[PDB]
Amino acid sequence: APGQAAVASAYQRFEPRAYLRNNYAPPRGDLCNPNGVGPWKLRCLAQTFATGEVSGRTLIDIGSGPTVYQLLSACSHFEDITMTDFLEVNRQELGRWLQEEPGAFNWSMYSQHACLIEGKGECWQDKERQLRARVKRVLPIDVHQPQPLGAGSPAPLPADALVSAFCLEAVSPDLASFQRALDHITTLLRPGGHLLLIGALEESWYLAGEARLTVVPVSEEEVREALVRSGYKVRDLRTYIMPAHLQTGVDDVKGVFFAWAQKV
Ligand SMILES: C[S@@+](CC[C@H](N)C(=O)[O-])C[C@H]1O[C@@H](n2cnc3c(N)ncnc32)[C@H](O)[C@@H]1O
Ligand SMILES: O=S(=O)(c1ccc2c(c1)CN[C@@H](CF)C2)N1CCSCC1
């Protein structure tokens, strides 16, 4: 309770535009360099889905924040998608892009790169069209509660698959809390279901405007073990080491991990 209400307090200052700018605009957001983290992440999301292994009807994105890139390759495999976030402002920022409102963040370069990578000959507008169509709702959530979505959420539970990028470690004061939060969201997944977990490796802080957030520094092994401890079978685990040119003043992240896990 103490460690959670403290994080919750820091997030009250979280500025979406500042977050988007620090991470999804160049240099980290430059998709032209094949060696950048942007191309690497999109590639690993596309290859995972191209296997045909991850499919079903409903999907939940845990801690969406103001981003949708994590769902570009996923959207053509799930007709009902639920996006979520703890903050009102992020859910509003998402709405601005989903409803094509004014001031929405421009994700077009990412959509185009996902199309380029997938190689199905799809134009980026159709991709965004399909994502917007399949995202049925944007709900509040708290991975710290035993029932993250709450009592009677509109979300079709359990889900056939889950996606979570940079949420758990960024809202957990320590490894133990990270483990619990993972246990918590795992209850939202159907047995045999899939979890695509993405996050920061050995990171301890990051900025988002006037907000300065703490992060729990986790390692690939710690993540692997935590996944096992939560009833998962790790189908794939990859690490991307942050090169010097992508190490800016916005945080102290050392690498990024990708975990494809199956609830057994
Ligand atoms: C660094 S962001 C990750 C956003 C996005 N998934 C991405 O890939 O960039 C962390 C997100 O977790 C949200 N969050 C904060 N406290 C949370 C909590 N207790 N439960 C769930 N999400 C929370 C924040 O509002 C924020 O959108
Ligand atoms: O690896 S990123 O640079 C990235 C993307 C998001 C974040 C971080 C790093 C590190 N701090 C996280 C907050 F804890 C947020 N990349 C941004 C371009 S698209 C793939 C993800």
Residue to mutate, 28, 33, 109, ligand 2, most ligand atoms under 8 Å from C-beta = 28
Report residue 68: phi and psi, to 5°.
-130, -5
Is residue 110 marked as binding?
no
Pocket of ligand 1 contains residue 111 by CB under 6 Å: no
Q: Please list the residues that pair with 241 across neighbouring strands.
A: 255
Ligand 1 centroid, distance to 32 Cα (angstroms) = 27
| Cβ atoms of 82 and 137 closer than 8 Å | yes
Residue 82 falls in which region: left (phi positive, over 0), alpha (psi -120 to 50) or beta: beta
Report residue 192: phi and psi, to 5°.
80, -5
Q: Note the resolution in Å, 1 decimal.
A: 2.0
Report residue 206: phi and psi, to 5°.
-160, 155
Distance between CA 136 and CA 90 in Å, rounded? 16
Technique used by the depositors: X-ray
Is residue 206 marked as binding?
no
Pocket of ligand 1 contains residue 45 by CB under 6 Å: no
Which amino acid makes up residue 39? Answer: P
Positive or negative, the CA dihedral 239, 165, 108, 49 is positive
| Cβ atoms of 57 and 33 closer than 8 Å | no
What token pair was written down for 166? 């940079």
Return the ligand number nearest the Cα of 64.
1
Q: What is the DSSP string of the chain?
A: -HHHHHHHHHGGG--HHHHHHHHHSTTTT--SSTTSHHHHHHHHHHHHHHTS-S--SEEEEET-TT--GGGTTGGGG-SEEEEE-S-HHHHHHHHHHHTT-TT----HHHHHHHHHHH-S---HHHHHHHHHHHEEEEE---TTSSSTT-SS-SS-SSEEEEEEES-HHHH-SSHHHHHHHHHHHHTTEEEEEEEEEEEEES--EEEETTEEEE-----HHHHHHHHHHTTEEEEEEEEEE--GGG--TTB---EEEEEEEEE-
221 burial level (CB within 10 Å; 0-12, 13-18, 19+): exposed
CA 243 to chain centre: 21
CA 34 to chain centre: 21
Task: For the beta carbon of residue 21, count every other beta carbon within 10 angstroms.
Answer: 16
Distance between CA 53 and CA 33 in Å, rounded? 29
Which amino acid residue places its CA nearest to atom 3 of ligand 1?
166
Pocket of ligand 1 contains residue 142 by CB under 6 Å: yes
Ligand 1 centroid, distance to 64 Cα (angstroms) = 6
Q: Any residues with Cβ below 6 Å from ligand 2, and which?
A: 23-24, 28-29, 37-38, 41, 69, 166, 170, 200, 203, 206, 215, 251, 253, 256
Beta carbons within 8 Å of 48's beta carbon, 6+ residues apart: 54, 73, 196, 236, 260
Residue to mutate, 23, 167, 258, ligand 2, most ligand atoms under 8 Å from C-beta = 23
Residue 158: asked if its preceding bond is cis (omega within 30°), the reply is yes
Q: What angle do CA 72, 73, 78 make, to 5 degrees?
A: 95
Positive or negative, the CA dihedral 184, 185, 190, 195 is negative
The minimum-distance atom of ligand 2 relative to the CA of 170 is 14
Residue range(s) defining the domain that contains residue 48 = 1-264
Task: For the beta carbon of residue 94, count every other beta carbon within 10 angstroms.
Answer: 24
- What CATH number corresponds to the domain at position 261? 3.40.50.150
Cα end-to-end span (Å), the chain:
30
Distance between CA 100 and CA 133 in Å, rounded? 12
Distance between CA 83 and CA 61 in Å, rounded? 5
189-201 and 205-208 as β-strands: parallel, antiparallel, unpaired?
A: unpaired
Task: For the beta carbon of residue 62, count every other beta carbon within 10 angstroms.
Answer: 27
Number of domains in the chain: 1
Distance between CA 175 and CA 156 in Å, rounded? 29
